[PDB]
Amino acid sequence: NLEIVLQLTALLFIVAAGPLVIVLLSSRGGNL
Amino acid sequence: GRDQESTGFAWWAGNARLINLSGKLLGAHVAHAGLIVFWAGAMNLFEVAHFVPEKPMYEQGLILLPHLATLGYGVGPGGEVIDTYPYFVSGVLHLISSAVLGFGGVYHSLVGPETLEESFPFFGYVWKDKNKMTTILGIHLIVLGLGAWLLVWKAMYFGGIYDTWAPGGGDVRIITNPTVSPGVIFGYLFRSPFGGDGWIVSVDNMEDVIGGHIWIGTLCIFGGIWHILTKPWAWARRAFVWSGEAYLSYSLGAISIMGFTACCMAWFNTTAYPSEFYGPTGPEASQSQTFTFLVRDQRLGANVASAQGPTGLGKYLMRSPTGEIIFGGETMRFWDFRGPWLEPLRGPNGLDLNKLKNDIQPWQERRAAEYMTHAPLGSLNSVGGVATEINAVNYVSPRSWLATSHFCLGFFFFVGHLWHAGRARAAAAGFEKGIDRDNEPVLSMRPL
Amino acid sequence: MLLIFQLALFAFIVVSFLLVVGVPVVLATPEGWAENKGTVFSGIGIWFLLVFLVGILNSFVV
Amino acid sequence: GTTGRIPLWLVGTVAGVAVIALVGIFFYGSYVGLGSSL
Amino acid sequence: VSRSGGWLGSDSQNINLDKWYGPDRVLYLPGGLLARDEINPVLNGTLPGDYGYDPLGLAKDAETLAKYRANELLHARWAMLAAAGAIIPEGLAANGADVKGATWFETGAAMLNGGTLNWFAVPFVNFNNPLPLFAVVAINVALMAAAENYRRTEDGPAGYAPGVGKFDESVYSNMDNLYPGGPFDPLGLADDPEVLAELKVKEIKNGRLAMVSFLGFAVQAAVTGEGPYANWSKHVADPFGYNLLTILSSEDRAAVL
Amino acid sequence: ESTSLWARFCEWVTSTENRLYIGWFGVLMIPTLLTATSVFIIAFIAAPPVDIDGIREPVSGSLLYGNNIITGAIIPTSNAIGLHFYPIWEAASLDEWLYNGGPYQLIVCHFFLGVCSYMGREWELSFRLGMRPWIAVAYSAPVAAATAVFIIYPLGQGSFSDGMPLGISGTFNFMIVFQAEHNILMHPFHMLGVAGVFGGSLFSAMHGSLVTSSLIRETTENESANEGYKFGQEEETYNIVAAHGYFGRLIFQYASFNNSRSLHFFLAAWPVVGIWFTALGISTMAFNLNGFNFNQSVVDSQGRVINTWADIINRANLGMEVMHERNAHNFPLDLA
Amino acid sequence: KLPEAYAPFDPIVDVLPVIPVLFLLLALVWQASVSFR
Amino acid sequence: LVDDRLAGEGTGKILGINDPSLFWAITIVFTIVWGVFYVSTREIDAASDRENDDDFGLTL
Amino acid sequence: MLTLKIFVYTVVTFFVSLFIFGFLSNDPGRNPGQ
Ligand code: CLA
Ligand code: CLA
Ligand SMILES: CC1=C(/C=C/C(C)=C/C=C/C(C)=C/C=C/C=C(C)/C=C/C=C(C)/C=C/C2=C(C)CCCC2(C)C)C(C)(C)CCC1
Ligand SMILES: CC1=C(/C=C/C(C)=C/C=C/C(C)=C/C=C/C=C(C)/C=C/C=C(C)/C=C/C2=C(C)CCCC2(C)C)C(C)(C)CCC1
Ligand SMILES: CC1=C(/C=C/C(C)=C\C=C\C(C)=C\C=C/C=C(C)\C=C\C=C(C)\C=C\C2=C(C)CCCC2(C)C)C(C)(C)CCC1
Ligand SMILES: [Cl-]
Ligand SMILES: [Cl-]
């Protein structure tokens, strides 16, 4: 099950990379 | 960005705020281009990773690898995949290229110039400038022509293109004599779209395929130079709406036609879409069933030519309404199907009876047997077979996915023409927001 | 070279993730494209160097 | 006490992700275990 | 009346020196990446091909820039002659011409052991050049040493050039160290000041292209061991099959499948 | 003012003073629809039986040949024809054209051009009257459905004989065979189509009942309430706030459209989007991408298959499959 | 499959193709952050 | 054979032109319609009140 | 049947030509707004 664990881990980053950008801009008062 | 307070467009029509922001509109189009290249790269690597050599391409749900195979990458004689490394570098090259394409999209969208008309007159444009619009049309017309010449260069100088009709079996072949005769080219273009004719979907040689792309490459280059050195004439100026949304609707109508044509190409054509990679077509599978039962019943002992069905028509062999000897049954409708495994048994008058009972090669039987079981029939959840079948086989033909999807895209982009072209005329005329309460046109008309 | 190649590919993935989040953040930030523009170019340059490094190392490992 | 409010868009985003995750699990379970034909 | 004119009909001469000279001169990075105030101040847009490109701060004053530009223009002009002269003879031999020592990095060995070279006046008859190696070394060194000393001392002997007819030592005076003109401009293409400024830009830009190209010719010779024409002909013949990556592989890559 | 023949002709064609607007799409719509109408009426009354399956077994579809209004139909073209173009001039005799199902192709081909031109004619009048141009977009939904069952489904299946017969009982045969071969009921797009028409029927009833419930008193009880409205009124004939108040209490305040413009867009979008997907559903099933197949999906611990309601549907689908086109199949698989 | 050198990175490839559909949702969450201005 | 027919079905003829007379039918009709249209363009444009210069046509 | 084919080709070309040159006759200018 190491394969699916790695797939979910990689999936966790990418589904968070997007919102990570928005929250950083929202917190830092960015031009978003 | 902007808001509805200063633009009048809500968030759900937000990209309409870019109509006159040429700089940001550039980044929008470059960013979507990065997405297209990203998907091509990501889906290519996804298919390469999930590729098992013990099955054919069409049994693994691959739609991009067949496109690479038809270009003659990593395929040996007979449609056998020998090496998937060329498929790998195709995915990597697109994936990396999407990054720089994505950066330019993000740069030209978020922090680049909003309008290019001031700082960069070469790239700046206003939709009303018909001359400038034609130059952009002319320029991008040349790169399309050059892209077409890449295909013929691949087919004539760089390895070649996979020919499913090649003598000695389907293989990668160098095209040395492309068919550039005007009669052949015009014959395909102005052919009927009905049965037997099939418009351009009936191109059945790689000589005609890359012969046509020579014409397309040349026409687009000359058309590019033409539309660069000339501005639209008076007849055109009084026939088209010269607005940014109007130009979009013209393209939407165009690629709607292209979407429908790709749907029919993937469904019927066996030259540009070899059955070795995309699987059998609808007509091919039905034609393969009667061929399979003709072969197996001969061994059991039966005169297939003299065998009658319940209806009195030939059980195995009958005549088309034009006289050609064809396979019997319901597949009488598919009598205009032509395939690499079936043409050797076909003479000038149709299927040759002597060759059908004396010279059926084992490879022809194996091809027809394989094509019958992989008929383009399946369910939404990818259950192979007719709707009245058990959950045993996990298979839907790539032709089914390609034809079904690009018809839905073709139809919706036709609604794009209807929507974006209707609005283009109304906005230019100036009543896209509603009827003037004090100046209603109908109120000034004679009653019916 | 297999371990060297995989380390370079992993480094390429990590720096790509930094650019995927870092670049839009500094671009949207008003001061970002004026001050952090220097460190963005370093990230782009390193990213391209790893592309070519992984590219040549692919020849000796595949 | 602690002054503050959770942003509404953040509530919608997290709830939206949870719903998408729940649907994905249902589609995952469609291919495994009971009801998978396997 | 003018000795200069356009190439595409009347009013087809449009020499824009603004793009290559002055504040709005093009730069090695676009507008959105590099601000014009970040350029080294010594690069003020008065020299041909001033793309404002000097990292490492090598040019720190006008004198240093002038000294290096004397080096750049000479390295550029020699590379232009070399780039053309390193690949043209090899292209002849590959197409069937009788050229001994086609590849540039093997011409020297051909003159060893008393062997000679064939000079091809390409449009016309070829030549079985009799000059032996000892003679070639002597004549080439003598002519080159004399020519370079005249450039170094900025003075030479009286002689004949078609543009100026017969000239004396006086013409060598008042000649630019880098753009002598005069006898060196027999066709008189430097008469128009606007044309001369534009053509100066084309000289270094073709020159800088040649310098990087010859660098590739050398690096490529070390790696692939073939002449530059052979590398080009086989990249064009099979691009994906013959490139840097394929050579570095140096093995029959097993099919992945 | 105009003196040129074409200038006067183009003014008449685009004239909004005609009782029925013609326009440029009408010079295509009128001849095609009249051609299809003429042959349809003549064929529905007096056409000879048609050999639809290509097995030399003609099927009677005309009133003068023993059918009533329900069972009468224009039989599709013969299976021997397939997708081949079969105009009347490609037949040796008009008797042969009738026998092979010629009239069906003539109707379908001219009718498809008629509805496409009818759609454009709807845009053209809106432009001539200075109104917003998206009634034609809403009309694209029924056009897509008509195009799917007359053109695209025959195209994918390989024969015009698989198109919908132009008749009432012929339509039912089309649906039943369609279920047996594609399991259309289990397809998510007929599901969206059903929600489109059930929802559209619900929304039509609700909007009609809510507006009727809110009519402002302007008449007596011995007169129709309709008399309270005068054609050309500048004021509203019903109280929108009152109707919103009723429906607000009926479920909850924010489940109701306070905006008439948003409400009417919703009334248009819901059925149009639903019919778009069910039209796509038939189009996708034309290329044999059938609906969900959950047969033998539930098996017990030891492997025994436990039937579900989907398996009972398969039993009904099995019965239709083995009975449609009884004499047409010589081989076990229905690949055509 | 991928080349043996790229085998450890296979799980990343298995999630890459779904990224483009995330951009549509990313635009939606971006508009929600700015209150659909 | 027993009967006569055009026998042009499924033969891939350009515009379906089995005989050259069909070419004259299409060409003559198109030329006539084009002929009456061509001699009326100026009158139609005159109604616009603008001259069909490089700035003529519906433009937003 | 050729006579029928030529008649139909004449008729179809006639109505299509009117459609084509109809929209080329400054169609966009035929609107009630200004
Ligand atoms: C292919 C899809 C696509 C693309 C390319 C664009 C592009 C654009 N949109 Mg748009 N939009 C889209 C879809 C898209 N949109 C959809 C589906 C909707 C409906 C919800 C909208 C609704 C919408 C509205 C309402 C508006 C826009 C606006 C804009 C423009 C400016 C946005 C901005 O500056 O705000 C800033 C955005 C951010 C700061 C957050 C995004 C940060 C980055 C870009 C995220 C991507 C990170 C990426 C992975 C990094 C890798 C790149 C590289 C390092 C490899 C821009 C050109 C605005 C406009 O019109 O300009 C006037 C605006 O008003 N859009
Ligand atoms: C259709 C795509 C397109 C178009 C029309 C433009 C247009 C423009 N760009 Mg832009 N850009 C793009 C894509 C595009 N760009 C991409 C993909 C990137 C990421 C690398 C950038 C990054 C970029 C930057 C950083 C800047 C511009 C700038 C500019 C403006 C002028 C200066 C310039 O040319 O700079 C860019 C010059 C280059 C990028 C040199 C590239 C070398 C050649 C042209 C590459 C061609 C390779 C080949 C044809 C590509 C094959 C096709 C591919 C899709 C497979 C100009 C209006 C400048 C600006 O906005 O001023 C404020 C600026 O600073 N661009
Ligand atoms: C290639 C690759 C890469 C890259 C990646 C990327 C590019 C990523 C991106 C990604 C993205 C781009 C992401 C994003 C996503 C999004 C999201 C996750 C969101 C969602 C949302 C939701 C779910 C919700 C919504 C809503 C709102 C809030 C409003 C209202 C309504 C609703 C609720 C619906 C990496 C680095 C890995 C490395 C390796 C390779
Ligand atoms: C403007 C804007 C928008 C959009 C944007 C976009 C669309 C972007 C794109 C972007 C992009 C388009 C990006 C891309 C990226 C990519 C990358 C970054 C790559 C990576 C790669 C890597 C990292 C590596 C990989 C590998 C190889 C090499 C081999 C195999 C293995 C592997 C896979 C590992 C939005 C909507 C938000 C809205 C707002 C505005
Ligand atoms: C590559 C290739 C080929 C082909 C080629 C070609 C040559 C194509 C072309 C095509 C062309 C060359 C053309 C087409 C099309 C066009 C179209 C489809 C359109 C038209 C449109 C429109 C839109 C019109 C309109 C109108 C006018 C007149 C103006 C205004 C008014 C109206 C709107 C009415 C072949 C087959 C061999 C196969 C293989 C590949
Ligand atoms: Cl039946
Ligand atoms: Cl059958």
Q: How far apart are CA B375 and CA B368, in angstroms?
A: 11
Is B49 in Cβ contact with G2 (below 8 Å)? yes
Q: Residue F313: which H helix or E strand, with range?
A: helix F309-321
Q: What is the DSSP letter of B202?
A: G
> In b/e form, how buried is each residue of B76-108, taking b as 16+ CB within 10 angstroms?
eeebebebbbbbbbbbbebbbbbbebbbbbbbb
According to the annotation, is F207 in a ligand binding site? yes
Taking contacts as CB-CB distances below 8 angstroms, the residues of chain C near A13 are: 17
Burial class of residue B297, CB neighbours in 10 A (0-12, 13-18, 19+):
middle
Q: Ligand 1, residue A31: give the atom nearest the CA.
A: 39
Is F133 in Cβ contact with B423 (below 8 Å)? yes
What residues of chain G, 3 to 32, have a C-beta less than 8 Å from chain C? 3-6, 8-9, 12
Q: How far apart are CA B356 and CA B346, in angstroms?
A: 9
Q: How far apart are CA E252 and CA F207, in angstroms?
A: 75
As a residue count, chain C comes to 62
Q: Ligand 3, residue G32: give the atom nearest the CA.
A: 29
Interface probe with G: pick from D5, D9, D23, most Cβ of G within 10 Å: D9
| Ligand 2 in reach of E31 Cβ (< 6 A) | yes
Residue in A closest to C17 by C-alpha: A17
Ligand nearest to the CA of B34: 4
- Tokens 């509203």 belong to F236
Please choose, from the candidates B364, B362, B294, B281, the residue with its C-alpha nearest in 3D space to the C-alpha of residue B325: B294
Please choose, from the candidates F182, B50, B378, D27, the residue with its C-alpha nearest in 3D space to the C-alpha of residue D36: D27
Going C22 to C27 to C29 to C34, the CA torsion angle's sign is: positive
Taking contacts as CB-CB distances below 8 angstroms, the residues of chain F near B328 are: 330
The resolution of the experimental structure, rounded to one decimal in Å, is: 2.7
Give yes or no for H5 touching F (CB within 8 A). yes
Q: Which two tokens stand for residue B38?
A: 């990203």
Residue in A closest to C24 by C-alpha: A21
Ligand 4 centre distance from Cα of residue B109 (Å) = 16
Query: What is the 3-class SS of chain E, one letter each residue?
Result: CCCCCCCCCCCCCCCCCCCCCCCCCCCCCCCCCCCHHHCCCCCCCCCCCCCCCCHHHCCCCHHHHHHHHHHHHHHHHHHHHHHHHHHHHHHHHHCCCCCCCCCHHHHHHHCHHHCCCEEECCCCCEEECCCCHHHHHHHHHHHHHHHHHHHHHCCCCCEEECCCEEECHHHHCCCCCCCCCHHHCCCCCCCCHHHHHHHHHHHHHHHHHHHHHHHHHHHHHHHHCCCHHHHHHHHHHCCCCCCHHHHHHCCCCCCCC
| Ligand 1 in reach of B124 Cβ (< 6 A) | no
Residue B182 makes CB contacts below 8 A (sequence gap 6+) with none
How far does C34 lie from chain B, in Å, by closest CA?
Answer: 11
According to the annotation, is F324 in a ligand binding site? yes
Name which residue sits closest to atom 21 of ligand 5, judged by CA.
B254
Gaps (C–N > 2.5 Å) in chain G: which residues precede them?
none
Give yes or no for F10 touching I (CB within 8 A). yes
Residue in G closest to C5 by C-alpha: G5
Ligand nearest to the CA of F332: 7
Name which residue sits closest to atom 64 of ligand 2, judged by CA.
E32
Q: Which two tokens stand for residue F134?
A: 């998206």
Q: What phi and psi, each to the nearest 5 degrees, are found at residue B165? A: -100, 10
CA E5-E7-E12 angle, 5° bins: 70
Q: Residue B173: which H helix or E strand, with range?
A: strand B171-173
According to the annotation, is F187 in a ligand binding site? no
- Tokens 């028509």 belong to B313
Strand B346-347, strand B317-319: pairing: unpaired
CA E114 to mean position of chain CA atoms:
31
In this structure, the number of other CB atoms found within 10 A of the CB of residue B384 comes to 20
Strand B317-319, strand B325-327: pairing: antiparallel
Strand B378-379, strand B350-351: pairing: unpaired
Going B351 to B353 to B358 to B362, the CA torsion angle's sign is: positive
Q: How far apart are CA F199 and CA B141, in angstroms?
A: 47
Q: Which two tokens stand for residue B10?
A: 């809500």
How far does B306 lie from chain E, in Å, by closest CA?
Answer: 48
SS3 assignment, position F27: helix
- Tokens 């002849």 belong to E92
Give yes or no for G29 touching D (CB within 8 A). yes
Q: How was this structure determined?
A: cryo-EM
Q: How far apart are CA B420 and CA B410, in angstroms?
A: 15
| Ligand 2 in reach of B85 Cβ (< 6 A) | no
Going F70 to F71 to F72 to F78, the CA torsion angle's sign is: positive
Please answer whether residues B350 and B324 qualify as being in contact, where contact means their C-beta atoms are separated by less than 8 angstroms: yes
SS3 assignment, position F108: helix
According to the annotation, is B324 in a ligand binding site? no
In the structure, do chain E and chain C come into contact, i.e. share 3 or more CB pairs under 8 Å?
yes
| Ligand 2 in reach of E125 Cβ (< 6 A) | no
Q: How far apart are CA F181 and CA B375, in angstroms?
A: 14
Q: Residue F147: which H helix or E strand, with range?
A: helix F135-147
Q: Ligand 5, residue B239: give the atom nearest the CA.
A: 30
| Ligand 2 in reach of B113 Cβ (< 6 A) | yes
Q: Residue B172: which H helix or E strand, with range?
A: strand B171-173
Residue B32 makes CB contacts below 8 A (sequence gap 6+) with B105
As a residue count, chain H comes to 60
Ligand 5 centre distance from Cα of residue F182 (Å) = 36
Q: How far apart are CA B80 and CA B370, in angstroms?
A: 14
Burial class of residue B406, CB neighbours in 10 A (0-12, 13-18, 19+):
buried
In the structure, do chain G and chain I come into contact, i.e. share 3 or more CB pairs under 8 Å?
no
